[PDB]
Amino acid sequence: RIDSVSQLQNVAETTKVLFDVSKETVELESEAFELKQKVELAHEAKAVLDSW
Amino acid sequence: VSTLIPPKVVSSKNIGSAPNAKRIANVVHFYKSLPQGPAPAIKANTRLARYKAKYFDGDNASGKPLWHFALGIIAFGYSMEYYFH
């Protein structure tokens, strides 16, 4: 029973770290969307200009 | 998408394994254990608890109380022979 208990003890603290970290990462991808639109506009502009 | 909350919900690992059942047994049993027993019964000096102390110990399988007790009945009826004769 002590063996079972020891696993759970360590988990309880450390999991909270991952919990935060995971959402933090997701936030970064939101910001990446703003980038994506910047990238997009540049690509489009270069293409129209290339045709000219 | 955000990580789900399963890892942090533990309250069904408190009955979830079999030694929880054993635990709730021996947290009572061993806690209510005495260092040594209450007493084994061997003597008490009622003057026949002494008979038990000499003869009817935990380790005495020695035939001596049997012999003594047998001889007692021999002493009983032998006198009764002379009560009837």
UniProtKB/Swiss-Prot annotation, chain A:
The modification Phosphoserine is found at S4. It is found in: Mitochondrion; Mitochondrion inner membrane. It comes from the Eukaryota. Coiled coil: none annotated. Mitochondrial membrane ATP synthase (F(1)F(0) ATP synthase or Complex V) produces ATP from ADP in the presence of a proton gradient across the membrane which is generated by electron transport complexes of the respiratory chain. F-type ATPases consist of two structural domains, F(1) - containing the extramembraneous catalytic core, and F(0) - containing the membrane proton channel, linked together by a central stalk and a peripheral stalk. During catalysis, ATP synthesis in the catalytic domain of F(1) is coupled via a rotary mechanism of the central stalk subunits to proton translocation. F-type ATPases have 2 components, CF(1) - the catalytic core - and CF(0) - the membrane proton channel. In yeast, the dimeric form of ATP synthase consists of 17 polypeptides: alpha, beta, gamma, delta, epsilon, 4 (B), 5 (OSCP), 6 (A), 8, 9 (C), d, E (Tim11), f, g, h, i/j and k. Present with 12900 molecules/cell in log phase SD medium. Belongs to the eukaryotic ATPase B chain family. This is ATP synthase subunit 4, mitochondrial. It comes from Saccharomyces cerevisiae (strain ATCC 204508 / S288c) (Baker's yeast). The lineage of its organism: Eukaryota, Fungi, Dikarya, Ascomycota, Saccharomycotina.
From Swiss-Prot, chain B:
The keyword Mitochondrion applies. Keywords: ATP synthesis, CF(0), Hydrogen ion transport, Ion transport, Membrane, Mitochondrion, Mitochondrion inner membrane, Transit peptide, Transport. It comes from the Eukaryota. One of its GO terms (biological process) is proton motive force-driven ATP synthesis. It is found in: Mitochondrion; Mitochondrion inner membrane. GO terms for cellular component: mitochondrial inner membrane; mitochondrion; proton-transporting ATP synthase complex. Belongs to the ATPase F chain family. Present with 14600 molecules/cell in log phase SD medium. F-type ATPases have 2 components, CF(1) - the catalytic core - and CF(0) - the membrane proton channel. In yeast, the dimeric form of ATP synthase consists of 17 polypeptides: alpha, beta, gamma, delta, epsilon, 4 (B), 5 (OSCP), 6 (A), 8, 9 (C), d, E (Tim11), f, g, h, i/j and k. Mitochondrial membrane ATP synthase (F(1)F(0) ATP synthase or Complex V) produces ATP from ADP in the presence of a proton gradient across the membrane which is generated by electron transport complexes of the respiratory chain. F-type ATPases consist of two structural domains, F(1) - containing the extramembraneous catalytic core and F(0) - containing the membrane proton channel, linked together by a central stalk and a peripheral stalk. During catalysis, ATP synthesis in the catalytic domain of F(1) is coupled via a rotary mechanism of the central stalk subunits to proton translocation. This is ATP synthase subunit f, mitochondrial. It comes from Saccharomyces cerevisiae (strain ATCC 204508 / S288c). The gene is ATP17.
